[PDB]
């Protein structure tokens, strides 16, 4: 039984993400009722906190528990950051995996990644038992305003 906690902290050093988010997030999730191990990750601007619960622990209890503890902790976190609650499943829930390709060239990376994020990602999340439809790869269209310093 696992429940994820993903907090985003933009541009902040990996060591800063730890000292202000990850660490104070793992030490509080340890003393949570029925927590076996709490593995943590401090990436350059990302705080992944994995919480593993002991055997035979009600899945939707371990969830509604993390959330109540994630309240009294939402304060100890920097102003801007917000502790997001992970999806219902795990790495194992990766059932169906596919790729989008157009060999005619009429469509490209971005045209398809958007096709995923705003069409397939919704025509699929409406299916019961499907907790999430994660888009992988491709390119996200970005309005790049390039300033000329001169």
């Amino acid at each position: 039984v696992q429940v994820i906690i993903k907090t985003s902290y933009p541009g902040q050093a990996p060591q800063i993400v730890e000292n202000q988010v990850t660490y104070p997030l793992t030490t509080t999730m340890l003393s949570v009722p029925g927590a076996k191990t709490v593995r943590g990750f401090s990436q350059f601007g990302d705080s992944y906190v994995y919480v593993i619960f002991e055997d035979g622990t009600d899945p939707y209890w371990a969830r509604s528990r993390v959330l109540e503890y994630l309240n009294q902790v939402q304060g100890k976190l920097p102003a801007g950051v917000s502790a997001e609650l992970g999806p219902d499943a795990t790495g194992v829930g990766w059932i169906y995996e596919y790729a989008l390709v157009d060999r005619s060239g009429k469509h490209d990376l971005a045209d398809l990644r958007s096709l995923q994020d705003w069409f397939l990602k919704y025509e699929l999340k409406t299916i019961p038992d499907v907790a999430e439809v994660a888009s992988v790869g491709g390119v996200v269209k970005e309005y790049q305003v390039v300033i000329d310093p001169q």
């Binding site: 059932i95 169906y96 499907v130 790869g137």
Partner: protein
């Protein structure tokens, strides 16, 4: 045409005066490659841990048929991982064996019990001890898997 500065004259200074506004790619976090002959965008269906995989894959399988019409001309959807393909090969193997034992046993309990009805009795007991085992599993909540059929 994003206003930055405007004199009394009415002559303004737009964003276009200090920047080119181009459409580009964002900082990529995930990269997908296919058959080592191109980069593509994909997607993975996440199943709510503890629900039925074979169950959902079906719904998904057919939903893509409903949309094969709604897709832009030239868009192909290549699959790269279907866990249902295994479940079937794993269930047809347990069934295959679960059937073989039966017969191999019937033949063995028909040679040491040289009467047709004598062996018949034991032959009729299996499909029953079978059913009772299955009925229980529905109340318990044990779906059919290689492990719950290996027993």
């Amino acid at each position: 045409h994003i206003v930055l500065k405007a004199s009394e004259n009415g002559v303004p200074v737009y964003l276009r005066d200090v920047a080119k506004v181009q459409i580009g790619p964002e900082m990529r976090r995930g990269i997908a490659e296919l058959n080592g002959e191109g980069e593509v965008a994909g997607g993975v269906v996440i199943l709510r841990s503890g629900k039925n995989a074979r169950e959902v894959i079906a719904a998904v399988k057919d939903k893509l048929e409903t949309l094969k019409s709604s897709l832009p001309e030239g868009v192909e959807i290549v699959t790269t991982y279907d866990r249902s393909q295994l479940i079937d090969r794993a269930i047809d193997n347990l069934s295959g064996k679960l059937l073989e034992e039966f017969i191999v046993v019937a033949v063995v309990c028909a040679l040491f019990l040289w009467h047709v009805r004598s062996a018949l009795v034991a032959i009729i007991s299996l499909p029953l001890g079978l059913c009772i085992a299955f009925i229980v599993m529905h109340f318990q909540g044990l779906n059919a898997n290689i492990m719950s059929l290996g027993g």
